[PDB]
């Protein structure tokens, strides 16, 4: 999921690998804006019965 971000990259930097060498922020090559990246959704399903 691409969302807005508040972090400020250096002028020559492109993307971020802060934790575990995983990309989470990518500079837009056109508008020169930084967009956050996050996987959309995943999880389990539980059923409650009496």
């Amino acid at each position: 999921v691409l969302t807005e971000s508040n972090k400020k990259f250096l002028p020559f930097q492109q993307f971020g690998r802060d934790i575990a060498d995983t990309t989470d922020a990518v500079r837009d090559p056109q508008t020169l804006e930084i967009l956050d990246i996050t996987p959309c959704s995943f999880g389990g399903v539980s059923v409650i019965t009496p």
Partner: peptide, 25 residues
Amino acid sequence: PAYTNSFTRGVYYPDKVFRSSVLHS
């Protein structure tokens, strides 16, 4: 001649990657 000590000079950015508040080797 006349060799000179270079204490902590000659370090650059190895990659075009943003990292904040993390120690990287």
